[PDB]
Scaffold this active site. Structure first.
Site, short mmCIF file in Angstrom:
data_model
loop_
_atom_site.label_atom_id
_atom_site.label_comp_id
_atom_site.label_asym_id
_atom_site.label_seq_id
_atom_site.Cartn_x
_atom_site.Cartn_y
_atom_site.Cartn_z
N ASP A 8 -2.54 7.44 19.39
CA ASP A 8 -3.20 7.77 20.65
C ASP A 8 -4.48 6.97 20.91
O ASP A 8 -5.22 7.31 21.82
CB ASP A 8 -3.54 9.26 20.74
CG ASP A 8 -2.35 10.10 21.15
OD1 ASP A 8 -1.46 9.57 21.85
OD2 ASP A 8 -2.30 11.28 20.76
N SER A 9 -4.74 5.91 20.15
CA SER A 9 -5.94 5.12 20.41
C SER A 9 -5.72 4.23 21.64
O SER A 9 -4.61 4.08 22.15
CB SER A 9 -6.31 4.27 19.20
OG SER A 9 -6.83 5.07 18.15
#
Ligand SMILES: [Mg+2]
Ligand SMILES: [Zn+2]
Ligand SMILES: [Zn+2]
Ligand SMILES: [Zn+2]
Ligand SMILES: [Zn+2]
Lengths: 99, 112, 662, 144, 97, 171, 107, 56, 196, 167, 118
Positions: I4-5
C-alpha cells in the site's frame, strides 16, 4: 534404547521403503560412492534434525496454536476453541457419531 | 481416549478453515491438558492450581489472592520457572541459560 | 556514576520462601515508630520526626540522604516502620480463611474438634498437599458443632476415652462485612466475636494442630494473621509527586496510613480515657475498615474509601492486580531503554536480513564498545568525531565506572582511550538489532536484523519479511531494540537472525517468501513469451551481487541474441538446487507450461508463481534453505528480488478499470 | 544543628566550587559543564492527590463513600465513627469555616483568587489570642 | 517502548536468555540491594562508605549478600512486606530438585 | 586465639589474566586478599598453609561479566577473638579514654571505665600515659588484658578489654 | 469382582473396604456391556512390576510426583484394577513416530 | 492464556519435555525427539498401491 | 510502492503538493497561592534563578513572551515564567542567597520547530494574566506521511522520485503519485478506478 | 533439611565453651570427614607460621639471638609477602615478642603433656599461651578450668611448663 | 492528546477480555559427588546445540572483548564475534559446558570434543 527404537521406527520404515534393494538398483541407479554419500548425508541430516535441548517448545507450541485462530452445522472456529480450552459441561452443538 | 478425542477436536477446529499446524504442538497442548489425569482447563481455576510456584500462578490472573494463599501456606518457590527468573531479573534456565559454562585448565595448558 | 562497590558476595536468588510476619520481627526490623499522622514539620520545610515521612524510613528527594543507611537515592532501598495497634484487627485477605479456621478449631480452648481417634480424620491426614488437606478438614469439621471432649475408642466402640477439649458446643460463625459473628445452639444467642479472642484462640493452638492444617511452624503461623503490629512501607513505595515542582501532593498510601494513625490515636484515647462499649466497637470497626481498605478497596458488600476529588482510593490490591499492576505492567512487561519506534516503508534494494535505520535514530541510540588493542584507532576516531556527526560516540566510560559525556568535553581536550574503557558509540552498519512488531503473536515477529544507516525518517526493511511481521505500510509502526553487550549481541545474531528463521516451526513451511508484486513480476519474467535483449540482459546479470561473472549463453543464438526469462532468473538460483513438481496434466512436455523443474541450478520449464517461490512447502525457498543453508537462502531472496524488481521496472505493470469488464 | 542530610553535586575532578552543573533531562543525567563527567544518572523527572500545605495545613484525611456494592448501614456506621473524632475537631471546624467562606464567596460570584486569599487569611489569622470574642460572621467578612 | 508480555514470550521462544536479562535488568532498572543470610528480607542497613552491614532482627554483620534485582521486583517485595507477607530471598537451595 | 581452619574463597578472576599460567595468577590474587585480611566469620586470616597443593575447583564464568568465579578451598591460620579469653599484649597508643593494646593482629581498646581507679591519665609527661601508685602503663609496655567483648563486621573486628580482674596487668 | 444389576446401597458400600490384601470391586452390568479396550481411541495398557517401575524411575531420573498421572476412577483404571502407586506403560499410535510409549502413575 | 499455560515447558538434555517442576509432559518431544523446523511432507510408498503393485 | 505504499513526485512536493501549515498553541497562566507565593512572566537570568533549562533564553522580551515572527528551534523556551522559593538553601551545589527564584518556563517540544505567529495576552474569568502562543510551521510531505484515497486506500510514502527518474507519458505529463496495482482488486475497490 | 531462622540461643562465651555456630569441636575437612578443632598456643602458632613461610620460600626458590632471627624473618617477610603485609609482620612480631618455646622439640613436649589431660583444644591452647604460675591464677584466668581439672594437676602441669622454657 | 480513527490495538491488554470472562531421589541427593557424572557414561548428545553454540560465541566474544589471550592466529580480524567464531571453528577455545539434567546432576563437555555440525 527401547524408547529410541520406538522413536525412530517410523523414519526407519520410511528409509526402508525408499532405500530398498529393488528401488535403488532399478529406479535410483546409484553407484557405491554415491550410496555411501547418501548414507552419510541421511545420517548427518537426521543428526542435525534432532530437537536441540533447552528449546522452549511449550511457548512455541502455544504461539503456533494461538496464531491460526486469529487468521479465520456444528460450531467451529473461535467459539469452539473457547469451548475446548475452557472445558464445559454443556456446549453449543453437542453431537454424537454412531457407526 | 479423552486425550485422543481432545487432540482430534482441536485438530478439527484448527483445520476447519484449512490452516495446518504441525502435530507436536498439538500433542504438547493436549498432553498438558491431560497430564493430571483429568481435563485440566486453561482457565484461572485450571492450570493455576498446581503447585508450580507462586509467581507463575500470580503472573496470569488473581495475583493478590494467589499471594495470600501462598503466604498463608508458606509455599517455597523453587525459582526454576521462567516468570520467577523474569521477575527476579536473573538469567532464566532456558535456551542459552539452560546450562553453565566453566573455564578449562587441562586443555588450556594443552594448547600452550 | 554507577553504583559504589560493596564487600558483600554477589549471589543469585535460588529460592523464594513466602509466609507471614510475626509482630516481634516487625518490631525488630523496624527503624522507627510512627506516632503522628502528619508528614511535614511545624515549619513545613523539613521531614517530621515520628511522622509518615521520617528520614529514618527513607527519602524521595535527590538532595536528601537517608537517616539510617546514610546513602543517596540510587542506593537506598527504604526502611520499614511499625505501628503498635491498640486492638488487633483481621487481615481482609484472610478473613474467610480465618473463618475456615473458625470452622476447624475450638472457640473456647483453642484445640481441634476431632483428633486422630476418627478414621475420617486419619484419611484426611493422608492428603499430602496443604490446600486439599485443609479443604477436606474444613469441609468435614464444619458439621461438627461440639468440642468432643470424650470420644469412643478407635479399636472398638465399647469404651469412652476422654481426649483433649472442653466439650463446649461450637457456635455457627458467619461473616458480616469485615467482622465475624457467632450464633450459639439453642437448647439462638448471637454475638460479635472480638478479634483479641480469636488471637488468644490462635495462640492456644498447638504446633501439630496447624501443622495438620498446613501452616508452617516457622514461617506462617495462623496467629500471625491477626494484625496487631502494622508494618509501614518506606517512602520509595509511596512517593510524593510534584505537579509544577512546588506542590507536595502525597500518594494514596500516605492518605490511608494517615487515616490508620488517626483511627489508632482515637482508639487509644478512647481506651485510656474511657468510653462505652458502643464507642469502642465503633472505633475498632473503623480501624479494621481503614486497614482493610488500605489493603483492598474493592470489597463486596462494603463501601470503598474515597478521595477528596471523588475518585476511589487506589489501594494495594488495585495497584497489584489488573493489567497495569506491578506484575503484568512493570515486571512481565516494562519500558526499556536503547529502543526506537517509527513507521515503516519497503526498500527492495536492502538485503533480507538488513533494516534501514534513520540517521537521527542512529545518533540517539548508543552501544558500548570497549576499548581493545584491536580497535583503538576506530574508537579514538569515533570519540574525536563527537556526538554531532554520525558515525560518532556519546559517552566514554572509564574503568572506575565514571562516565564522560562527550558534549561539554571538547573544550577540555581529547581523552586518550586506554584498554578496558567503554565507548558508547553510535550504531554503525552491520550492528545486529532486534526488531519488533506488536502484537507479536508468534516468534517470527521478533527478529534480528543488521543496521544500514539511511538518510530519512522511516524504518526500511526487505519486502519478503513483511509476511512474518504481519506488516503493511499503511501507517504501521515497528520497534527496534539494541543489545548492550557482546554476549547479547552475539546470541541475537546467532539465534534470532533473519536467515535462521526462514522456515517456521509453526507449520514446517517457510514463513517468508517472494510475495506481492515481486511475486507478480516473476510470473511475467519466466513466461514463454518473455525474451530479453542484450542491453537489458547485461544489467539484469549485473544486479546479482553473487553473479558468477560469466555471461549465460542465449537461448536464442541467431537471428537475434535473446535470453529467455527463465535463463536470467536461473542466475539468481545457486547451483546444486534441484526441484521437481507437477500440477494437473503436467508432463515432461508442457503445453500449459505449469509445473516446475530446476536441474543443476537452472530452470528447465515451468513458470514461477506462488507455488514455487511463495510461502509454501516444496517450493524453491524451502529446498534451498534445507539443502544449502540459511545464508544462501537469504542471498537468494535478495538476488531474486533485485532481478525481478529491475525487470518489472524496465517492463512495467498496471491494472485498470478495463481489466474488470467483460 | 541536627543532621545535615544534604547532597551537593560537586565534580570530583575539576574541584571548582560552585561547579557549573547541566541537568540533561532528555538523556537523564547530571553532568559537569567543564569536563563532561556525569554526576548522577537515572534521574527522576498522577498517582496521588494534590494538596498544598499552605491553604489548609498538613491535614491528611479521606472520606467514605458508596462503592460498587455498598451496604447503607455500614456507610452510616463509618460516617458516625468519623464524626466522633476528637483529635481533628480544630481541623473539622476550620474545614467547615472554609466551606462556608467558599460558599458565601461563590454565591457572590467572585473569582477564585478571592476565595484562595480569604482562605489563607482565615488560616493564618486563626487561633489568635487578640481575636477570640468576635462573632464568626465578622471574622468571615473581614477575611473576605 | 513497551517490551510487553508477548514480546517476552517470543524471546522465550527464541531461547535468547541474556537478551531477556538485559531487557529486564540493564535497560530499565538494575537495582543492587543487600539481603540477610538468616532472614531473606532486604531490610539490611548498609553503610558502604563505612563498609558496615547490620541487619535488624538477626543482629548479624557477617552474613549479608548483595543481589541484582529489578526495582519493580524490589517494590513488589516491599509492598508485599507492607501486606504482612514476607518474600524471603535466599541465595542457596534447600531441597533437592 | 590462633586456630587452623579450612576456608573457601570466591575469587573473581578477570579475563585479562586468562593466560596459560593462570594458576599462578590465581594463587597470587588469592594471597593478595587473604594475608592480613580481617573477616568476621573466621577472624583475622594471617597465613596460608599447604602451598604445594591448594584445591582449586572449576571456575564459573559470570553470566554478564565474563570473569571466572573460582571457588578456591584453602587451609589457613586465623586469629579469632572471643569474649572471656585472656590475652597478653603491648600498649601501642594511649589517651584519657584509655589505651590500645596490640594482641596479634588486633588493637584491643581498654577504656577509662575498665581499669581500677588508681590509674590516672597525664599528658604533661612525654608520652601522655597512665600512672598509678604501684605501676605505670606506657607505650611498648607488656600488659595482660581480658576480652570483655568483641564486635565483628564483614571486614573489621574490634574488641574491648579490661584489666580490672586481679592477676592481670604488667608481668 | 462383584457384578450387580441396578445399584448398590450405601450400607453395603461402606463395608466394601475390607481386610487387606483382599479387595472388593463392584461393576454394573450396564456399564460393562462393551469392552472399552476394543475401542480405537483406547491404546494398549501394560501394568508394570515394581522392578520395572524402579528401573523407569532410575533411568529417566524421575520421582514419584514427576510422572504423568491417571486417576483411580478412570474406566481403563478400573478395567485393569489399578491401585495407588503403580505405573502403567501406555503404547499408542503416533502420526510422527508410528508407536509411542508413555507412562502414567495411578493416583 | 495458552502462552501462560505452556510457559515453563522445555526439552531438557535427556530429550524429555518437562515443565518447571520437572514433571514429565512427554517422554520425548513430539513423540519422536524432532525439531519442527526440519520437517517435510513425505509420501510413504508402501502404504499405497495394491498387493500386486507392492510385489512389483 | 509495495504494501500500500505510494511513490510521490519529489518535484510535485517541491511545488507545494500537500504542503501544509501546522499551528500549535501553548497556554500559560498565573495563579495566586496566597500572600507572596505567586508566579510571574519575566525573562529568567543565570544570576538569580534556580533549575535553569539548557535551552537558549535570548528569544524572549522584557515581559518574558517571545515576539511573533521569531524563529524557534528544538526545546527552546517561548514563555518565561518564574516563581519565588525559600532563600538560603543547600541543594545541588549551585544554591546561594542570590537564587531567590526558580524557573517555571514552558519550553517548546524537543522535536517541533517553526515560526512564532501570534502571541496573545489576556485575562480569564479569575482576572489573572494568561497567554497563548501559536507556533506555525511547515509540514513538507516526506517519507512516512500517510496519504489516503477517497476509498480507504491509505498508505505511507514509500519513496520520492524527482521528475527525470519517475515515468512519463508521451504528452510529458509525469504523474503526481504512483500507487501499487495490487491494492485495487484484493480490496475490490472499483470506485477508485471509475473516479479516476 | 533445616528450617533456618534466628532461633533462641545463648550468646558467644569463651567460658562456657560456646565458640560460635562454626567454631565447633568437630570440624568438616575438604575431604568431608570430621576432625578435632586445631587450636594453637603462641609458640606453636609461631612455629606453624615460620615453617609456612620457609615452605613458601622453598616453593618459590625452585621455580638463638633474638635480633638475628628478627632480621631473618623480616627479610623473609619482605621477599615473600606481597601487598598488605603489615598485619602479618605485626602479628609475627607479637608472636616473637611473647614466644616462650624456640624449637619444635619443646613444642612437641608441650603438646604431648597437654594431650594426656583429655581437655578441649581451647584450654590446652590457653594453658600453652598463658604464662601462669599459680593454680588460683589459672582458675581466675580461664573460668572453664573450674570443676574440670584438679588443683595439684594444674600445679604439676604449670611447674613442668615453667621448667620447660628457655630464654 | 489526539482523536484518530486509525484503529491501533492496545497490546498486552488482554485484561479487557479477562474481565469479559471471569466466570466459569534415588540416584542423586544433597550436594555429594554423584552429581558430577564422569565421562564414560555421559548420556547427552555429543553435538553442540544452537543455544550452546550461541552462548559459547557470546562468552568467547566477551572474553576477547575484555582482552583475553587469543589462542588463534588472526588475519587482521577486529570484531570479537568473528574472532570467537574463528576460535571455535578450529577448536582452540578452552571452555567447557555443564549440561544440566533435571534432577540436579550434570555432565561436563569440552567444546574441543563437541562436534560442531551447524
Ligand atoms: Mg497496517
Ligand atoms: Zn536508607
Ligand atoms: Zn474446646
Ligand atoms: Zn568537571
Ligand atoms: Zn536478617
Amino acid at each position: 534404547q527401547n524408547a529410541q527404537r520406538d522413536a525412530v521406527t517410523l523414519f526407519c520404515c520410511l528409509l526402508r521403503s525408499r532405500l530398498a534393494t529393488r528401488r535403488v538398483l532399478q529406479e535410483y541407479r546409484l553407484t557405491k560412492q554415491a550410496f555411501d554419500w547418501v548414507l552419510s548425508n541421511i545420517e548427518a541430516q537426521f543428526l542435525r534434525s534432532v530437537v536441540h535441548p533447552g528449546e522452549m517448545v511449550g511457548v512455541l507450541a502455544a504461539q503456533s496454536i494461538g496464531e491460526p485462530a486469529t487468521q479465520m452445522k456444528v460450531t467451529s472456529g473461535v467459539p469452539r476453541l473457547k469451548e475446548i480450552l475452557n472445558v464445559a459441561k454443556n456446549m453449543k452443538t453437542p453431537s454424537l457419531t454412531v457407526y | 481416549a479423552g486425550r485422543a478425542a481432545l487432540y482430534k477436536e482441536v485438530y478439527n477446529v484448527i483445520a476447519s478453515d484449512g490452516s495446518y499446524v504441525n502435530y507436536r504442538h498439538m500433542a504438547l497442548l493436549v498432553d498438558v491438558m491431560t497430564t493430571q489425569g483429568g481435563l485440566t482447563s486453561v482457565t484461572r481455576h485450571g492450570f493455576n492450581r498446581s503447585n508450580t510456584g507462586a509467581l507463575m500462578r500470580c503472573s496470569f490472573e488473581e495475583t493478590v489472592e494467589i499471594l495470600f494463599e501462598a503466604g498463608a501456606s508458606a509455599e517455597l518457590d523453587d525459582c526454576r520457572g521462567v516468570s520467577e527468573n523474569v521477575i527476579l531479573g536473573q538469567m532464566a534456565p532456558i535456551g542459552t541459560g539452560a546450562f553453565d559454562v566453566m573455564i578449562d585448565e587441562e586443555s588450556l595448558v594443552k594448547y600452550m | 556514576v554507577g553504583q559504589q562497590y560493596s564487600s558483600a558476595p554477589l549471589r543469585t536468588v535460588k529460592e523464594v520462601q513466602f509466609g507471614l510476619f510475626s509482630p516481634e520481627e516487625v518490631r525488630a526490623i523496624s527503624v522507627a515508630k510512627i506516632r503522628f499522622p502528619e508528614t511535614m514539620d511545624e515549619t513545613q520545610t523539613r521531614a517530621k520526626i515520628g511522622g509518615l515521612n521520617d528520614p529514618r524510613l527513607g527519602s524521595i528527594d535527590r538532595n536528601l540522604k537517608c537517616q539510617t543507611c546514610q546513602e543517596g537515592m540510587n542506593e537506598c532501598p527504604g526502611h520499614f516502620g511499625h505501628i503498635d495497634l491498640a486492638k488487633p484487627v483481621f487481615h481482609v485477605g484472610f478473613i474467610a480463611k480465618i473463618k475456615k479456621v473458625c470452622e476447624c478449631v475450638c472457640m473456647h480452648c483453642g484445640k481441634l474438634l476431632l483428633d486422630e481417634h476418627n478414621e475420617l480424620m486419619r484419611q484426611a491426614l493422608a492428603i499430602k498437599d496443604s490446600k486439599k488437606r485443609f479443604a477436606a478438614i474444613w469441609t468435614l469439621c464444619k458439621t461438627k458443632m461440639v468440642c468432643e471432649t470424650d470420644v469412643p475408642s478407635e479399636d472398638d466402640p465399647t469404651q469412652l476415652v476422654s481426649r483433649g477439649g472442653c466439650g463446649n458446643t461450637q457456635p455457627t460463625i458467619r461473616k458480616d462485612g469485615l467482622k465475624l459473628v457467632g450464633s450459639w445452639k439453642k437448647d439462638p444467642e448471637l454475638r460479635v466475636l472480638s478479634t483479641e479472642e480469636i488471637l488468644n484462640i490462635f495462640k492456644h493452638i498447638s504446633v501439630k494442630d496447624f501443622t495438620s492444617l498446613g501452616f508452617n511452624e516457622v514461617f506462617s503461623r495462623p496467629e500471625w494473621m491477626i494484625l496487631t503490629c502494622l508494618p509501614v512501607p518506606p517512602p520509595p513505595v509511596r512517593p510524593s509527586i510534584s505537579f509544577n515542582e512546588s506542590q507536595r501532593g502525597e500518594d494514596d498510601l500516605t492518605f490511608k496510613l494517615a487515616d490508620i494513625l488517626k483511627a489508632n490515636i482515637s482508639l487509644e484515647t478512647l481506651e485510656h480515657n474511657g468510653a462505652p462499649h458502643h464507642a469502642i466497637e465503633e472505633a475498632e470497626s473503623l480501624l479494621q475498615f481503614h486497614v482493610a481498605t488500605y489493603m483492598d478497596n474493592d470489597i463486596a458488600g462494603q463501601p470503598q474509601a474515597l478521595q477528596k476529588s471523588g475518585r476511589p482510593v487506589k489501594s494495594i490490591r488495585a495497584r497489584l492486580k489488573g493489567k497495569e499492576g506491578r506484575i503484568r505492567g512493570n515486571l512481565m512487561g516494562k519500558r526499556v531503554d536503547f529502543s526506537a519506534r517509527t513507521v515503516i516503508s519497503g526498500d527492495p534494494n536492502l538485503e533480507l536480513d538488513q533494516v534501514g535505520v534513520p540517521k537521527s535514530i542512529a545518533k540517539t541510540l548508543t552501544y558500548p564498545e570497549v576499548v581493545t588493542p584491536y580497535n583503538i584507532d576506530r574508537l579514538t576516531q569515533l570519540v574525536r568525531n563527537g556526538p554531532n556527526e554520525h558515525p560518532g560516540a556519546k559517552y566514554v566510560i572509564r574503568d572506575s565506572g565514571d562516565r564522560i559525556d562527550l558534549r561539554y568535553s571538547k573544550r577540555a581536550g581529547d581523552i586518550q582511550l586506554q584498554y578496558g574503557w567503554k565507548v558508547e558509540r553510535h550504531i554503525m552498519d552491520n550492528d545486529p538489532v532486534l526488531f519488533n512488531r506488536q502484537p507479536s503473536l508468534h516468534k517470527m515477529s521478533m527478529m534480528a536484523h543488521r543496521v544500514k544507516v539511511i538518510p530519512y525518517s522511516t524504518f526500511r526493511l526487505n519486502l519478503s519479511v513483511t509476511s512474518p511481521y504481519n506488516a503493511d505500510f499503511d501507517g504501521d509502526e515497528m520497534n527496534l531494540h539494541v543489545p548492550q553487550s557482546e554476549e547479547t549481541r552475539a546470541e541475537l545474531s546467532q539465534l534470532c537472525a533473519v536467515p535462521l528463521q526462514i522456515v517456521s516451526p509453526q507449520s514446517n513451511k517457510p514463513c517468508m517468501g517472494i510475495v506481492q508484486d515481486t511475486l507478480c513480476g516473476i510470473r511475467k519474467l519466466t513466461l514463454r513469451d518473455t525474451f530479453i535483449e542484450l542491453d537489458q540482459v547485461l544489467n539484469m546479470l549485473y544486479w546479482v551481487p553473487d553473479w558468477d561473472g560469466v555471461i549465460p549463453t542465449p537461448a536464442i543464438i541467431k537471428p537475434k541474441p535473446l535470453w529467455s526469462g527463465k535463463q536470467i532468473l536461473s542466475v539468481a538460483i545457486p547451483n546444486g538446487i534441484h526441484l521437481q513438481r507437477f500440477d494437473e496434466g503436467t508432463t515432461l512436455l508442457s503445453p500449459k507450461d505449469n509445473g516446475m523443474l530446476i536441474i543443476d541450478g537452472q530452470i528447465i520449464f515451468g513458470v514461477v508463481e506462488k507455488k514455487t517461490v511463495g510461502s509454501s512447502n516444496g517450493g524453491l525457498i524451502h529446498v534451498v534453505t534445507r539443502e544449502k543453508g540459511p545464508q544462501v537462502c537469504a542471498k537468494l531472496f535478495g538476488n531474486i528480488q533485485k532481478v525481478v524488481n529491475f525487470w518489472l521496472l524496465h517492463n512495467g505493470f498496471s491494472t485498470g478499470i478495463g481489466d474488470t469488464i467483460a | 544543628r541536627g543532621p545535615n542530610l544534604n547532597i551537593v553535586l560537586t565534580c570530583p575532578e575539576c574541584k571548582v566550587y560552585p561547579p557549573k552543573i547541566v541537568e540533561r533531562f532528555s538523556e537523564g543525567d547530571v553532568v559537569c559543564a567543564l569536563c563532561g563527567l556525569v554526576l548522577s544518572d537515572k534521574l527522576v523527572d498522577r498517582v496521588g492527590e494534590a494538596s498544598n500545605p499552605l491553604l489548609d495545613g498538613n491535614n491528611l484525611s479521606t472520606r467514605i463513600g458508596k462503592g460498587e456494592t455498598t451496604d447503607m448501614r455500614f456507610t452510616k456506621e463509618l460516617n458516625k465513627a468519623q464524626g466522633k473524632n476528637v483529635m481533628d475537631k480544630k481541623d473539622n471546624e476550620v474545614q467547615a469555616a472554609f466551606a462556608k467562606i467558599t460558599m458565601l464567596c461563590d454565591a457572590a460570584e467572585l473569582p477564585k483568587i478571592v476565595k484562595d486569599c480569604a482562605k489563607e487569611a482565615y488560616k493564618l489569622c486563626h487561633d489568635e489570642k487578640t481575636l477570640k470574642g468576635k462573632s464568626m460572621e465578622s471574622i468571615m467578612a473581614a477575611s473576605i | 517502548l513497551r517490551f510487553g508480555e508477548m514480546e517476552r514470550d517470543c524471546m522465550i521462544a527464541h531461547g535468547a536468555a541474556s537478551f531477556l536479562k538485559e531487557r529486564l535488568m540493564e535497560a530499565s532498572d538494575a537495582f543492587r540491594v543487600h539481603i540477610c543470610g538468616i532472614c531473606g528480607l532486604m531490610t539490611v542497613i548498609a553503610k558502604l562508605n563505612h563498609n558496615q552491614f547490620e541487619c535488624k532482627g538477626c543482629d548479624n554483620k557477617i552474613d549479608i549478600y548483595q543481589i541484582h534485582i529489578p526495582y519493580a521486583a524490589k517494590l513488589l517485595f516491599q509492598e508485599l512486606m507492607a501486606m504482612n507477607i514476607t518474600p524471603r530471598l535466599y541465595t542457596d537451595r534447600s531441597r533437592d530438585f | 586465639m590462633f586456630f587452623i581452619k579450612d576456608l573457601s574463597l570466591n575469587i573473581t578472576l578477570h579475563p585479562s589474566f586468562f593466560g596459560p599460567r593462570m594458576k599462578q595468577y590465581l594463587k597470587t590474587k588469592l594471597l593478595e586478599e587473604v594475608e592480613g585480611s580481617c573477616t568476621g566469620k573466621f577472624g583475622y586470616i594471617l597465613c596460608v598453609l599447604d602451598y604445594d597443593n591448594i584445591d582449586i575447583q572449576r571456575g564459573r564464568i559470570l553470566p554478564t561479566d565474563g570473569s571466572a568465579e573460582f571457588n578456591v578451598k584453602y587451609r589457613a591460620v586465623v586469629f579469632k577473638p572471643f569474649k572471656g579469653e585472656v590475652v597478653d599484649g603491648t600498649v601501642v597508643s594511649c589517651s584519657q579514654h584509655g589505651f590500645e593494646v596490640q594482641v596479634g593482629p588486633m588493637k584491643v581498646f581498654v577504656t577509662k571505665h575498665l581499669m581500677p581507679q588508681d590509674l590516672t591519665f597525664n599528658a604533661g609527661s612525654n608520652p601522655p600515659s597512665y600512672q598509678s601508685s604501684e605501676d605505670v602503663i606506657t607505650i611498648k609496655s607488656r600488659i595482660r588484658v581480658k576480652i570483655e567483648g568483641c564486635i565483628s563486621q564483614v571486614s573489621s573486628i574490634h574488641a574491648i578489654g579490661s584489666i580490672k580482674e586481679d592477676y592481670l596487668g604488667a608481668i | 469382582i462383584f457384578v450387580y444389576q441396578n445399584n448398590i446401597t450405601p450400607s453395603a458400600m461402606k463395608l466394601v473396604p475390607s481386610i487387606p490384601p483382599a479387595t472388593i470391586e463392584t461393576f454394573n452390568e450396564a456399564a460393562l456391556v462393551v469392552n472399552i479396550t476394543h475401542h480405537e481411541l483406547v491404546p494398549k495398557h501394560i501394568r508394570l512390576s515394581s522392578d520395572e517401575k524402579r528401573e523407569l524411575l532410575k533411568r529417566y531420573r524421575l520421582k514419584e510426583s514427576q510422572l504423568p498421572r491417571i486417576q483411580r476412577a478412570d474406566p481403563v483404571a478400573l478395567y485393569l484394577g489399578l491401585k495407588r502407586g503403580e505405573v502403567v506403560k501406555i503404547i499408542r499410535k503416533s502420526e510422527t513416530s508410528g508407536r509411542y510409549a508413555s507412562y502414567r502413575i495411578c493416583m | 492464556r495458552l502462552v501462560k499455560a505452556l510457559e515453563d515447558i522445555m526439552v531438557h538434555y535427556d530429550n524429555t519435555t518437562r515443565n518447571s517442576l520437572g514433571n514429565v509432559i512427554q517422554f520425548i518431544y513430539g513423540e519422536d525427539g524432532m525439531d519442527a523446523a526440519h520437517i517435510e511432507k513425505q509420501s510413504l510408498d508402501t502404504i499405497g498401491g495394491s498387493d500386486a503393485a507392492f510385489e512389483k | 510502492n509495495q504494501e500500500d505504499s505510494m511513490i510521490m513526485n519529489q518535484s510535485s512536493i517541491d511545488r507545494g503538493l500537500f504542503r501544509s501549515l501546522f499551528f500549535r498553541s501553548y497556554m500559560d497562566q498565573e495563579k495566586k497561592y496566597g500572600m507572596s507565593i505567586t508566579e510571574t512572566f519575566e525573562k529568567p537570568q543565570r544570576t538569580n534563578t534556580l533549575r535553569m533549562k539548557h535551552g537558549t533564553y535570548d528569544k524572549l522580551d522584557d515581559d518574558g513572551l517571545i515576539a511573533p515572527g521569531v524563529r524557534v528551534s528544538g526545546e527552546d523556551v517561548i514563555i518565561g515564567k518564574t516563581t519565588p522559593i525559600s532563600p538560603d538553601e543547600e541543594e545541588l551545589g549551585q544554591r546561594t542567597a542570590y537564587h531567590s527564584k526558580r524557573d517555571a518556563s514552558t519550553p517548546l517540544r524537543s522535536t517541533e520547530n517553526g515560526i512564532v505567529d501570534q502571541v496573545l495576552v489576556t485575562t480569564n474569568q479569575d482576572g489573572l494574566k494568561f497567554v497563548k502562543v501559536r507556533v506555525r510551521t511547515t509540514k513538507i510531505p516526506q517519507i512516512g506521511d500517510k496519504f489516503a484515497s477517497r476509498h480507504g486506500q491509505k498508505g505511507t510514502i514509500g519513496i520520492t522520485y524527482r521528475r527525470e527518474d519517475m515515468p512519463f507519458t508521451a504528452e510529458g505529463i509525469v504523474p503526481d503519485l504512483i500507487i501499487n496495482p495490487h491494492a485495487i482488486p484484493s480490496r475490490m475497490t472499483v470506485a477508485h478506478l471509475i473516479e479516476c | 533439611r533445616r528450617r533456618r531462622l534466628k532461633k533462641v540461643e545463648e550468646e558467644e562465651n569463651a567460658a562456657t565453651l560456646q565458640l560460635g555456630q562454626e567454631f565447633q569441636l568437630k570440624q568438616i575437612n575438604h575431604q568431608g570427614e570430621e576432625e578435632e578443632l586445631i587450636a594453637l598456643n603462641l609458640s606453636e602458632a609461631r612455629l606453624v607460621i615460620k615453617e609456612a613461610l620457609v615452605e613458601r620460600r622453598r616453593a618459590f626458590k625452585r621455580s638463638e639471638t633474638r635480633e638475628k632471627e628478627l632480621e631473618s624473618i623480616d627479610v623473609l617477610l619482605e621477599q615473600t609477602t606481597g601487598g598488605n603485609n603489615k598485619d602479618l609482620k605485626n602479628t609475627m612480631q607479637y608472636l616473637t615478642n611473647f614466644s616462650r618455646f624456640r624449637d619444635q622439640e619443646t613444642v612437641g613436649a608441650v603438646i604431648q603433656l597437654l594431650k594426656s589431660t583429655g581437655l578441649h583444644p581451647f584450654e590446652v591452647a590457653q594453658l600453652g599461651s598463658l604464662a601462669c604460675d599459680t593454680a588460683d591464677e589459672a582458675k581466675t584466668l580461664i573460668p572453664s578450668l573450674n570443676n574440670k581439672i584438679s588443683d595439684d594437676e594444674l600445679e604439676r602441669i604449670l611447674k613442668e611448663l615453667s621448667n620447660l622454657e628457655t630464654l | 492528546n489526539e482523536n484518530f480513527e486509525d484503529f491501533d490495538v492496545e497490546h498486552f491488554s488482554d485484561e479487557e477480555t479477562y474481565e469479559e470472562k471471569p466466570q466459569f531421589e534415588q540416584i542423586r541427593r544433597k550436594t555429594l559427588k554423584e552429581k558430577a557424572i564422569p565421562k564414560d557414561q555421559r548420556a547427552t548428545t555429543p553435538y553442540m546445540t544452537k543455544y550452546e553454540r550461541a552462548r559459547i560465541l557470546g562468552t568467547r566474544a566477551l572474553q576477547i572483548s575484555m582482552n583475553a589471550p587469543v589462542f588463534v592466529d588472526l588475519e587482521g580480524e577486529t570484531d570479537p564475534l568473528r574472532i570467537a567464531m574463528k576460535e571455535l571453528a578450529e577448536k582452540k577455545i578452552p571452555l567447557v559446558i555443564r549440561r544440566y539434567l533435571p534432577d540436579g546432576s550434570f555432565e561436563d563437555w569440552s567444546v574441543e570434543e563437541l562436534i560442531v555440525d551447524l
